[PDB]
Amino acid sequence: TKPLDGINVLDFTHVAAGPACTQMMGFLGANVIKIERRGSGDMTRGWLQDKPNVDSLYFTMFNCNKRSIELDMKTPEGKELLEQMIKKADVMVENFGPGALDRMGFTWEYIQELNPRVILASVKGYAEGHANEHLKVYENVAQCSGGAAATTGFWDGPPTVSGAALGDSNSGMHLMIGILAALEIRHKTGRGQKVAVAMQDAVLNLVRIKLRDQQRLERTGILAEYPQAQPNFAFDRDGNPLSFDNITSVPRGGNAGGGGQPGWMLKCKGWETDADSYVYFTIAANMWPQICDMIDKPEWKDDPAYNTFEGRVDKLMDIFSFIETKFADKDKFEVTEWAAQYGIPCGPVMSMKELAHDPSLQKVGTVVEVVDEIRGNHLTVGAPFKFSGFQPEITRAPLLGEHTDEVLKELGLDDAKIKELHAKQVV
Amino acid sequence: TKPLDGINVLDFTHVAAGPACTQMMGFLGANVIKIERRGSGDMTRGWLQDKPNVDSLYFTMFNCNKRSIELDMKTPEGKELLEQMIKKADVMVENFGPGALDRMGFTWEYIQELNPRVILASVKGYAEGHANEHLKVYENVAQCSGGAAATTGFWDGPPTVSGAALGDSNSGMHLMIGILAALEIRHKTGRGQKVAVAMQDAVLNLVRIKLRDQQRLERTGILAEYPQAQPNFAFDRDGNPLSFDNITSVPRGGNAGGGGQPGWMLKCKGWETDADSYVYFTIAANMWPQICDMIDKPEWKDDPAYNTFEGRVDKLMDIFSFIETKFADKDKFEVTEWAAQYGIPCGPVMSMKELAHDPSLQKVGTVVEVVDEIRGNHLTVGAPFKFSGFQPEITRAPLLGEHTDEVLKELGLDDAKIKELHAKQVV
Ligand SMILES: *SCCNC(=O)CCNC(=O)[C@H](O)C(C)(C)COP(=O)(O)OP(=O)(O)OC[C@H]1O[C@@H](n2cnc3c(N)ncnc32)[C@H](O)[C@@H]1OP(=O)(O)O
Ligand SMILES: *SCCNC(=O)CCNC(=O)[C@H](O)C(C)(C)COP(=O)(O)OP(=O)(O)OC[C@H]1O[C@@H](n2cnc3c(N)ncnc32)[C@H](O)[C@@H]1OP(=O)(O)O
Ligand SMILES: O=C([O-])C(=O)[O-]
Ligand SMILES: [Cl-]
Ligand SMILES: [Cl-]
Fold first, then answer.
1. How far does the centroid of ligand 5 lie from the alpha carbon of residue B14, in Å?
2. Is B254-350 a domain of CATH 3.30.1540.10?
3. What distance in Å separates the CA atoms of residue A202 and residue B358, rounded to the nearest whole number?
4. Cβ of B103 less than 6 Å from ligand 2
5. Can you give the residue ranges of every domain in chain B?
């Protein structure tokens, strides 16, 4: 049916990393119960609101397919309700600060006692055992810790944060792998396990190519395909040349390919007044004769100075800027169309507005309009993985404490004692 | 014991997205057999080599914990062998061009017939159903398609690619989620499924927050926390201050926080000569009194225009520029120390050099030294998820066709059958 039908998730998560994880689990069928702080709830509810006193898109786009119960966990009644909820859980997920769940009495060893089958899943800034394991980390600090900021941006500019969430959402997706892997062994062992993902580690995983380049740099003293190795091309703020005779750590490469097939961000008609009027253009080696046809340079097919990676490696930026002259009267889509004819790897910079309203993305269920008959409908990113056997069924994000009574009734409590919980301000 | 012990993976993958997926499965215990092209194999082998005739770091860092068999798939004998291996496998992973696996005999339907239990998993550039479904895509082409490039970099500069592999390694990790979930649902149904991740979609999932902001911008006309909403701070092509008056698609915010928690990338001692001499300084909501003690300005603790987020939103760049001048005489670790005592979300930009040789990442198994007796030892990224019950054991990447005979013998083929295949140039 759905892969995670019948998986009960006890969801302590707030902000983006942990909530990304449990939402996606909900999309694949999981029964997700989100524990929130009394009164305020998850911080994302009040962050970046578009309508005063309505849960922000920060919350709703990260908390569909969930039920909400308010709970003070620093109370003896709270800790007992938790213990019951743990015993009915398949997976516990949390992204509090280091040691926070521990100080609430819920260490991994006490969890194993409560439920031998329950998996504990954590997001933390740094890994257990790291000198920095006790630090609290948000999105951009995480990008800085993992090598991404150092290797993103231009050579004459600062380290640059990525708009893609390398810290939060990426750690949550990585945590989902750990959880599903724990489920795979549990079928063998009949036991739960602790799984943790550090935000620094998740970033380092996406920056595997830069660790490749660090070693290449150490071993050979040069990265020939980098802009800093191109003849008289890269310079710092004072006009000093930037070259590898001076570079001991992977530099920022601007819009360079990043791997074995050179590329660049090329202006298309309208770039002066439209921030996204660009294509990315890749010189794939198997594609060079086709590139020569497209740009009307037949003399470049048989020239050893042009017809191999090695020959072009000292003239990359010359070739890119000449190719770019061909795009001056064409918008990004017609350039993309034109290259597509030759089979050349080329594509548009898609604007957020263009993606938000693209028919193909809605048709495939990657951009989903959520039916929210309380707040009004909104877009979300759906499941990025498509399956032959099932489609996700995305339902609206809960109001704060909307399923508190519904959830307490599922624990076999009666109307009288649940009123005591509201009275004692535990719920 | 490891989660994926006894899971058999028939691995068609090449380049980066697919190999990352299968390597990481191999790290979790899976038996990975990699089909490669005769003579040249996976194209990463001869890309960005540091030594002539030695498999590159591009190949070894994406291909540990795998065996190699050479195979010409478009021969009758190749298709015959492929059919035998499909019946042994639990998971088939591929990232060929659109329809390429179909064209050599093996459609999803034909695969089901061969093995009702096998899961087909694919990385594509665009989702099946998409208008751009036909397009072959590389790393940065996907980053542009998925909205990352449009929202990364500066307002006065071009769309900017991320050093992090949002297209390749990220889609591969997303595909691993899809495979594992298909393994969960196979415990019920007793049948395999087809699963696919589009590179555009994996990129989009990490820019969920930018789709949040797109709706915020369409709904309200402004994004208050963005630099373009700051009084006389950012400027345009000629000199005019920017505003959201004429911005209808999510813009580039430079080093802005990207969320409800503000931030900026601040210079440290030696920034002129060291590109990574920087910290990121976040201003969390509750952590405000801690910050006021450091800046040598206790005026802001009571000041109505400084103690609220709605009060701070109109002078964000005034505060960041001043606290930068304090850091002029301290390096990035001293600045982070000067702030860790307050639990302030400040962190250093870590260089690739620092990360490759950091003691903590090695201790926790995130940067791993692979024992490679053929080529020499190299570094790699290990498993970014940490488990209580096991630890990955990372073994060197195979030589081309290193295991061909060994793999062929496992299918019960005699020495004569093997030598016939070598002579006929099938293997
Ligand atoms: S997506 C980017 C966010 N980063 C991460 O997910 C990385 C891991 N998380 C963290 O480092 C922090 O949790 C972040 C998200 C940075 C936020 O830090 P805060 O300091 O604002 O919040 P904490 O999680 O550290 O929680 C503080 C204390 O409050 C207690 N608490 C939470 N919820 C409840 C409820 N419902 N009832 C009672 N107490 C509750 C936490 O246990 C924590 O306890 P302490 O003992 O005081 O630390
Ligand atoms: S980091 C992520 C990179 N990109 C992706 O993973 C996205 C999906 N893959 C692709 O878009 C392409 O595979 C890319 C990476 C762009 C490479 O393009 P190629 O020009 O190399 O095209 P193919 O990889 O699909 O290969 C071309 C033909 O060769 C056949 N083939 C592969 N391997 C063999 C072996 N061993 N034996 C015989 N034939 C083989 C493919 O089936 C394909 O067939 P055609 O029918 O000719 O297209
Ligand atoms: O990064 C890439 O994909 C490249 O360079 O081809
Ligand atoms: Cl996020
Ligand atoms: Cl990659």
1. 11
2. yes
3. 16
4. yes
5. 1-253+351-427, 254-350
